[PDB]
């Protein structure tokens, strides 16, 4: 159930260029005879993609990252690749996503799985039901913390006569999948051309994903030795992995509504021109398409090299306070203070700021700060605000309408109350 598989055939990883591949309908909207520019996680054109082989005993199924998305394409003839795995650590300590395809059905689970190294689906014969079953317990040992399950029609359906391209995304709480099946006769690498991927599902798993791995099948028909890193043979099935990035594309639409072409605006200045003019044809001439701007490299922070702390302690933790009609004023100057600690302290029942927030207050310099302190009762606390009316705001302490500061209050019944 958890056997290893450690055949040792080392070959360096190959790379290929994705000429124009990975385009998908960004929304479920119909468009015809129109050029549309949209920004979304796409596979840049002529992108440097890795290449992995599974031909004989060379097997390539490492754990790869899932930075922002994946363009997964597979040239197959025997449906050797059955599905994928997604997660952070792929062990029982964290939740992980699983996608596998049974004949004429799909299994999707979000459990805390404990995958063994070099997993795979096993195929055998059962001698009852008279049919070669496909038990999936080689992939994972245990399944804890299951929250989600889902079944649907096959995602993958039938040298390489067919091409299956997939697009995976992990947007805020939805795992989005775009797919396309294109038949081709090329056997070496990706066929240069164009084909858009239509959306398939949007799973609301709501988890954190950083790594992913692929699932393949093995053939052990001609003979079967004991379970070990041997006795397995993999047919010719290869797959390519590409990472998506936020990119602005210009999409074309035909009469039918299919894409059939697109343009990556930041590929080259000519693409910038095409996107600027909202056309795939540029007439002879000179066009203004963008603006060159040198960006800063680092920040420069300069302040007077003085060393002193503002005496907020003798203002807040003062032994006695003043009456509101004779409210005391303290002028704070020539010192350094941390308003973050003040805001952190939960001794205060009221902490409303105006024209500036306290979290963005311990990085702004002022010439003078005035600390006015007094004592009022509960229902009068709301009167200490710009544009308020009452006995206190009219006759005792009035705040301007352009006030820039914070109002702090706390219940002092334990200190300012007498039994009589």
């Amino acid at each position, epitope marked *: *159930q958890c056997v290893n598989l450690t055949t040792r055939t080392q070959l360096p990883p190959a790379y290929t260029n994705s000429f124009t591949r990975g385009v998908y309908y960004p929304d479920k909207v119909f468009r015809s005879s129109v050029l549309h520019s949209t920004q979304d996680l796409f596979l840049p054109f002529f992108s440097n993609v890795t290449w992995f082989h599974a031909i004989h005993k060379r097997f390539d199924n490492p754990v790869l990252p899932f930075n922002d998305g994946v363009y997964f394409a597979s040239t197959e003839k025997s449906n050797i690749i059955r599905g994928w795995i997604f997660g952070t650590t792929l062990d029982s300590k964290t939740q992980s996503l699983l996608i596998v395809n049974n004949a004429t059905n799909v299994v999707i689970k979000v459990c805390e799985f404990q995958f063994c190294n070099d997993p795979f689906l096993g195929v055998y014969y*059962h*001698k*009852n039901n008279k049919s070669w079953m496909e*038990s999936e*317990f080689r992939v994972y040992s245990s399944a804890n913390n299951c929250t989600f399950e889902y079944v649907s029609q096959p995602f993958l359906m039938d040298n390489f006569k067919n091409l299956r391209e997939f697009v995976f995304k992990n947007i805020d709480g939805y795992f989005k999948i775009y797919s396309k099946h294109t038949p081709i006769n090329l056997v070496r690498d990706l066929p240069q051309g164009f084909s858009a991927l239509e959306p398939l599902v949007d799973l609301p798993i709501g988890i954190n994903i950083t790594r992913f791995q692929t699932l393949l099948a093995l053939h052990r028909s001609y003979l079967t*030795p*004991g*379970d070990s890193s041997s006795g397995w043979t993999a047919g010719a099935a290869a797959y390519y992995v590409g990472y998506l990035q936020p990119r602005t594309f210009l999409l074309k639409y035909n009469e039918n509504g299919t894409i059939t072409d697109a343009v990556d605006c930041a590929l080259d200045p000519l693409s910038e021109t095409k996107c600027t003019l909202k056309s795939f044809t540029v007439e002879k001439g000179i066009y203004q398409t963008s603006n060159f701007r040198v960006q800063p490299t680092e920040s420069i922070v300069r302040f007077p090299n003085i060393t002193n702390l503002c005496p907020f302690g003798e203002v807040f933790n003062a032994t006695r306070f003043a009456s509101v009609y004779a409210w005391n004023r303290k002028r704070i100057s020539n010192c350094v203070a941390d308003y973050s600690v003040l805001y952190n302290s939960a001794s205060f029942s009221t902490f409303k700021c105006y024209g500036v927030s306290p979290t963005k207050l311990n990085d702004l310099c002022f010439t003078n700060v005035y600390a006015d302190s007094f004592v009022i009762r509960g229902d009068e606390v709301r009167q200490i605000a710009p544009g308020q009316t009452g006995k206190i705001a009219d006759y005792n302490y009035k705040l301007p309408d352009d006030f820039t500061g914070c109002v702090i209050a706390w219940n002092s019944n334990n200190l300012d109350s007498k039994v009589g």
Partner: antibody, heavy 115, light 106 residues
């Protein structure tokens, strides 16, 4: 990962006794299951094995024709039907999970063949 | 396949080196030879499989060697918990066990 045997006790020679093994904590239907016995103060003696799907069975030469091993994958149980018992079959019978070898062993059921 | 273990009883003290042998009447297929430990009142516990592969949780003082018909289990520095009966097993052609070696304190 836990195996609990049941059905032990005294049985008169010539009569029958059925042992059962209840499994939990693992994918029972994916492992072959063995029976092993140990006479008091003597060594281990393999008795029978049943494949994970119940299609293939094998028995020790000393019990061929008399013992039958079965399993129920829906109820996570393995059974050993012991017919025409002899005094020399008195032993502790262990239920054990295949890993091949056996890596998970039950505590065993004591079977005494006596009048 | 008959497995004959030797010696029948081994008497040693903690800290010493123990060598246990297992001989098969026929060559074992695929080095399918395992070793098991049994303490009184306890079920057996896997120590070694594949003739030389240590089972999970088994300390490195246990090591297995041999091929064909002749196999050895070595315990490099005996600990008190290591005094027990040891059985070898072949699993290449049916499933048969040795008669056991008792490792006792001298």
């Amino acid at each position: 990962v836990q195996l609990v045997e049941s059905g032990g006790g005294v049985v008169q020679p010539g009569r029958s006794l059925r042992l059962s093994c209840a499994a939990s904590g693992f994918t029972f239907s994916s492992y072959g299951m063995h029976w092993v016995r140990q006479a008091p103060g003597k060594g281990l003696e393999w008795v029978a094995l049943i494949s994970y799907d119940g299609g293939n069975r094998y028995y020790a030469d000393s019990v061929k024709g008399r013992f039958t091993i079965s399993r129920d994958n829906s109820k996570n149980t393995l059974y050993l039907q012991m017919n025409r018992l002899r005094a020399e079959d008195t032993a502790m019978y262990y239920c054990a999970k295949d890993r091949y070898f056996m890596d998970v062993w039950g505590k065993g059921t004591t079977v005494t063949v006596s009048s | 396949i008959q497995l004959t273990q030797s010696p029948g009883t081994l008497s040693l003290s903690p800290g010493e080196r123990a060598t246990l042998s297992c001989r098969a009447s026929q060559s074992i297929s695929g080095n399918y030879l395992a070793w098991y430990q049994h303490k009184p009142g306890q079920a057996p516990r896997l120590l070694i499989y594949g003739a030389s592969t240590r089972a999970t949780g088994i300390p490195d003082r246990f090591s297995g060697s041999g091929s064909g018909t002749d196999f050895t289990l070595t315990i490099s520095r005996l600990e008190p918990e290591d005094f027990a009966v040891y059985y070898c097993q072949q699993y290449g052609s049916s499933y048969t066990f040795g008669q056991g070696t008792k490792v006792e304190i001298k």
